[PDB]
Protein backbone atom coordinates (compact mmCIF):
# COMPACT_ATOMS: atom_id res chain seq x y z
CA UNK A 1 0.00 0.00 0.00
CA UNK A 2 0.96 3.62 0.68
CA UNK A 3 2.95 2.45 3.74
CA UNK A 4 5.07 -0.10 1.84
CA UNK A 5 8.18 2.07 1.43
CA UNK A 6 8.30 3.30 5.03
CA UNK A 7 10.43 1.53 7.68
CA UNK A 8 8.53 -0.58 10.23
CA UNK A 9 10.07 1.39 13.13
CA UNK A 10 8.98 4.68 11.51
CA UNK A 11 5.41 3.39 11.12
CA UNK A 12 5.19 2.49 14.83
CA UNK A 13 6.64 5.89 15.76
CA UNK A 14 4.15 7.79 13.58
CA UNK A 15 1.27 5.72 14.99
CA UNK A 16 2.32 6.92 18.45
CA UNK A 17 2.42 10.50 17.15
CA UNK A 18 -1.03 10.05 15.60
CA UNK A 19 -2.36 8.76 18.95
CA UNK A 20 -1.03 11.87 20.70
CA UNK A 21 -2.70 14.12 18.09
CA UNK A 22 -5.90 12.00 18.24
CA UNK A 23 -5.68 11.20 14.50
CA UNK A 24 -7.05 7.67 14.81
CA UNK A 25 -7.54 7.19 11.06
CA UNK A 26 -3.84 7.87 10.44
CA UNK A 27 -2.90 5.84 13.52
CA UNK A 28 -4.77 2.85 12.09
CA UNK A 29 -3.14 3.28 8.67
CA UNK A 30 0.36 3.39 10.16
CA UNK A 31 -0.34 0.20 12.20
CA UNK A 32 -1.83 -1.55 9.15
CA UNK A 33 1.46 -0.66 7.43
CA UNK A 34 3.43 -2.17 10.34
CA UNK A 35 1.33 -5.36 10.41
CA UNK A 36 1.95 -5.78 6.66
CA UNK A 37 5.73 -6.03 7.22
CA UNK A 38 4.92 -9.60 8.26
CA UNK A 39 6.57 -9.59 11.71
CA UNK A 40 4.96 -10.38 15.07
CA UNK A 41 3.65 -7.46 17.11
CA UNK A 42 4.83 -6.99 20.69
CA UNK A 43 2.43 -6.29 23.57
CA UNK A 44 2.86 -2.53 23.07
CA UNK A 45 2.26 -2.69 19.30
CA UNK A 46 -0.88 -4.89 19.60
CA UNK A 47 -2.34 -2.28 21.93
CA UNK A 48 -1.55 0.50 19.41
CA UNK A 49 -3.34 -1.54 16.72
CA UNK A 50 -6.38 -2.05 18.94
CA UNK A 51 -6.54 1.58 20.14
CA UNK A 52 -6.49 2.92 16.54
CA UNK A 53 -9.30 0.79 15.08
CA UNK A 54 -11.45 0.76 18.23
CA UNK A 55 -11.46 4.58 18.09
CA UNK A 56 -12.08 4.68 14.32
CA UNK A 57 -15.04 2.29 14.51
CA UNK A 58 -16.20 3.82 17.81
CA UNK A 59 -16.59 7.15 16.01
CA UNK A 60 -18.56 5.51 13.18
CA UNK A 61 -20.75 3.68 15.70
CA UNK A 62 -21.55 6.90 17.62
CA UNK A 63 -22.48 8.66 14.36
CA UNK A 64 -24.55 5.65 13.35
CA UNK A 65 -26.39 5.81 16.69
CA UNK A 66 -27.10 9.56 16.37
CA UNK A 67 -28.53 9.09 12.86
CA UNK A 68 -30.48 5.98 13.89
CA UNK A 69 -32.05 7.80 16.84
CA UNK A 70 -32.99 10.85 14.72
CA UNK A 71 -34.38 8.46 12.10
CA UNK A 72 -36.55 6.70 14.71
CA UNK A 73 -38.13 9.82 16.19
CA UNK A 74 -39.41 10.58 12.67
CA UNK A 75 -39.97 7.10 11.19
CA UNK A 76 -43.06 6.48 13.35
CA UNK A 77 -45.36 7.43 10.49
CA UNK A 78 -48.41 9.69 10.13
CA UNK A 79 -46.29 12.81 10.74
CA UNK A 80 -43.53 14.32 8.57
CA UNK A 81 -40.99 12.05 6.91
CA UNK A 82 -38.48 14.36 5.22
CA UNK A 83 -37.84 11.87 2.40
CA UNK A 84 -34.95 9.36 2.17
CA UNK A 85 -32.19 11.64 3.49
CA UNK A 86 -31.73 10.25 7.02
CA UNK A 87 -31.74 6.61 5.85
CA UNK A 88 -29.38 7.50 2.99
CA UNK A 89 -26.77 9.08 5.25
CA UNK A 90 -27.10 6.31 7.85
CA UNK A 91 -26.49 3.71 5.09
CA UNK A 92 -23.39 5.70 4.05
CA UNK A 93 -21.98 5.60 7.57
CA UNK A 94 -22.82 1.88 7.76
CA UNK A 95 -20.95 1.07 4.55
CA UNK A 96 -17.90 2.94 5.86
CA UNK A 97 -18.14 1.10 9.21
CA UNK A 98 -18.44 -2.21 7.37
CA UNK A 99 -15.34 -1.30 5.34
CA UNK A 100 -13.16 -0.65 8.41
CA UNK A 101 -14.40 -3.81 10.15
CA UNK A 102 -13.67 -5.80 6.98
CA UNK A 103 -10.12 -4.37 7.02
CA UNK A 104 -9.38 -5.28 10.63
CA UNK A 105 -10.78 -8.80 10.14
CA UNK A 106 -8.60 -9.19 7.04
CA UNK A 107 -5.39 -8.20 8.87
CA UNK A 108 -6.33 -10.62 11.68
CA UNK A 109 -6.95 -13.48 9.21
CA UNK A 110 -4.09 -12.30 6.92
CA UNK A 111 -2.08 -12.73 9.12
CA UNK A 112 -2.06 -11.92 12.86
CA UNK A 113 -3.91 -15.03 14.07
CA UNK A 114 -1.83 -17.29 11.80
CA UNK A 115 1.61 -16.37 13.10
CA UNK A 116 0.91 -15.73 16.80
CA UNK A 117 2.93 -17.56 19.49
CA UNK A 118 2.01 -16.32 22.96
CA UNK A 119 -1.18 -17.72 24.43
CA UNK A 120 -1.62 -14.03 25.25
CA UNK A 121 -1.25 -13.10 21.57
CA UNK A 122 -3.71 -15.74 20.30
CA UNK A 123 -6.30 -14.61 22.84
CA UNK A 124 -5.75 -10.91 22.04
CA UNK A 125 -6.41 -11.42 18.31
CA UNK A 126 -9.32 -13.86 18.76
CA UNK A 127 -10.89 -11.26 21.09
CA UNK A 128 -10.42 -8.59 18.41
CA UNK A 129 -12.03 -10.93 15.86
CA UNK A 130 -15.03 -11.27 18.18
CA UNK A 131 -15.27 -7.50 18.63
CA UNK A 132 -15.16 -6.54 14.94
CA UNK A 133 -17.71 -9.22 14.10
CA UNK A 134 -19.85 -7.86 16.97
CA UNK A 135 -19.67 -4.35 15.44
CA UNK A 136 -20.76 -5.77 12.07
CA UNK A 137 -23.68 -7.53 13.80
CA UNK A 138 -25.00 -4.30 15.34
CA UNK A 139 -25.85 -3.02 11.83
CA UNK A 140 -26.32 -6.25 9.83
CA UNK A 141 -29.53 -8.04 8.84
CA UNK A 142 -30.83 -11.39 7.63
CA UNK A 143 -28.62 -14.33 6.65
CA UNK A 144 -25.54 -12.08 6.79
CA UNK A 145 -26.40 -11.27 10.43
CA UNK A 146 -26.64 -14.94 11.46
CA UNK A 147 -23.32 -15.76 9.75
CA UNK A 148 -21.66 -12.85 11.60
CA UNK A 149 -23.10 -13.72 15.02
CA UNK A 150 -21.82 -17.30 14.79
CA UNK A 151 -18.43 -15.96 13.65
CA UNK A 152 -18.18 -13.61 16.65
CA UNK A 153 -19.27 -16.32 19.08
CA UNK A 154 -16.86 -18.88 17.62
CA UNK A 155 -13.97 -16.41 18.04
CA UNK A 156 -14.96 -15.30 21.56
CA UNK A 157 -15.43 -18.89 22.77
CA UNK A 158 -12.03 -20.07 21.52
CA UNK A 159 -10.41 -17.01 23.11
CA UNK A 160 -12.12 -17.87 26.44
CA UNK A 161 -11.11 -21.54 26.35
CA UNK A 162 -7.45 -20.64 25.88
CA UNK A 163 -7.61 -17.84 28.43
CA UNK A 164 -9.07 -20.09 31.16
CA UNK A 165 -6.28 -22.57 30.47
CA UNK A 166 -3.36 -20.15 30.08
CA UNK A 167 -3.90 -16.86 31.93
CA UNK A 168 -4.43 -15.81 35.59
CA UNK A 169 -8.03 -14.77 36.44
CA UNK A 170 -6.89 -11.13 36.83
CA UNK A 171 -5.05 -10.98 33.49
CA UNK A 172 -6.40 -7.83 31.71
CA UNK A 173 -6.70 -9.54 28.33
CA UNK A 174 -8.58 -12.38 29.99
CA UNK A 175 -10.77 -9.82 31.80
CA UNK A 176 -11.32 -7.57 28.76
CA UNK A 177 -12.31 -10.63 26.72
CA UNK A 178 -14.86 -11.82 29.26
CA UNK A 179 -16.23 -8.24 29.54
CA UNK A 180 -16.74 -8.00 25.79
CA UNK A 181 -18.04 -11.56 25.44
CA UNK A 182 -20.62 -10.81 28.14
CA UNK A 183 -21.57 -7.64 26.20
CA UNK A 184 -22.02 -9.83 23.11
CA UNK A 185 -24.38 -12.12 25.05
CA UNK A 186 -26.46 -9.16 26.19
CA UNK A 187 -26.51 -6.98 23.09
CA UNK A 188 -26.10 -9.34 20.10
CA UNK A 189 -26.99 -12.94 21.06
CA UNK A 190 -30.13 -11.98 23.02
CA UNK A 191 -28.88 -13.95 26.05
CA UNK A 192 -29.01 -11.49 29.03
CA UNK A 193 -28.88 -14.25 31.65
CA UNK A 194 -25.71 -15.70 30.09
CA UNK A 195 -24.32 -12.13 29.99
CA UNK A 196 -24.96 -11.55 33.70
CA UNK A 197 -23.72 -15.06 34.57
CA UNK A 198 -20.40 -14.50 32.76
CA UNK A 199 -19.80 -10.99 34.08
CA UNK A 200 -20.41 -12.09 37.70
CA UNK A 201 -18.35 -15.27 37.40
CA UNK A 202 -15.50 -13.23 35.89
CA UNK A 203 -15.57 -10.58 38.63
CA UNK A 204 -15.80 -13.10 41.50
CA UNK A 205 -12.97 -15.27 40.15
CA UNK A 206 -10.85 -12.12 39.79
CA UNK A 207 -11.52 -11.21 43.45
CA UNK A 208 -10.91 -14.77 44.67
CA UNK A 209 -7.45 -14.68 43.00
CA UNK A 210 -6.66 -11.01 43.48
CA UNK A 211 -3.12 -11.92 44.54
CA UNK A 212 -2.38 -12.69 40.87
CA UNK A 213 -2.30 -9.38 39.14
CA UNK A 214 1.02 -8.04 38.10
CA UNK A 215 3.05 -4.91 38.75
CA UNK A 216 2.83 -4.16 35.01
CA UNK A 217 -0.94 -4.18 34.43
CA UNK A 218 -2.90 -4.16 37.71
CA UNK A 219 -4.28 -0.70 36.84
CA UNK A 220 -5.76 -2.17 33.64
CA UNK A 221 -7.12 -5.14 35.61
CA UNK A 222 -8.86 -3.14 38.34
CA UNK A 223 -10.52 -0.86 35.77
CA UNK A 224 -12.02 -3.77 33.80
CA UNK A 225 -13.17 -5.33 37.10
CA UNK A 226 -14.99 -2.06 37.83
CA UNK A 227 -16.45 -2.04 34.29
CA UNK A 228 -17.78 -5.56 34.89
CA UNK A 229 -19.51 -4.45 38.11
CA UNK A 230 -20.95 -1.37 36.35
CA UNK A 231 -22.54 -3.46 33.57
CA UNK A 232 -23.97 -5.79 36.25
CA UNK A 233 -25.48 -2.73 37.99
CA UNK A 234 -27.04 -1.68 34.69
CA UNK A 235 -28.26 -5.17 33.70
CA UNK A 236 -29.88 -6.12 37.05
Amino acid sequence: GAMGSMERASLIQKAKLAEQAERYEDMAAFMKGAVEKGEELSCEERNLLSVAYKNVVGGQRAAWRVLSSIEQKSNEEGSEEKGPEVREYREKVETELQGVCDTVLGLLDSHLIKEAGDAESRVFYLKMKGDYYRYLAEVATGDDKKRIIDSARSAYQEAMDISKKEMPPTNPIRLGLALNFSVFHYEIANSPEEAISLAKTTFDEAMADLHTLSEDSYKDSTLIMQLLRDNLTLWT
Binding site: V183, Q226, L227, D230, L234, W235
Partner: peptide, 18 residues
Protein backbone atom coordinates in the same frame (compact mmCIF):
# COMPACT_ATOMS: atom_id res chain seq x y z
CA UNK B 1 -10.86 6.35 34.85
CA UNK B 2 -14.22 7.77 35.88
CA UNK B 3 -14.56 9.32 32.41
CA UNK B 4 -13.88 5.89 30.91
CA UNK B 5 -16.52 4.45 33.26
CA UNK B 6 -19.19 7.06 32.49
CA UNK B 7 -18.71 6.70 28.72
CA UNK B 8 -19.03 2.92 29.08
CA UNK B 9 -22.24 3.35 31.09
CA UNK B 10 -23.76 5.70 28.47
CA UNK B 11 -22.88 3.36 25.56
CA UNK B 12 -24.32 0.27 27.29
CA UNK B 13 -27.48 2.08 28.43
CA UNK B 14 -28.09 3.25 24.85
CA UNK B 15 -28.75 -0.37 23.86
CA UNK B 16 -31.11 -1.00 26.77
CA UNK B 17 -33.10 2.16 25.95
CA UNK B 18 -33.30 1.96 22.16
Amino acid sequence: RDKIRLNNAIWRAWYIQY
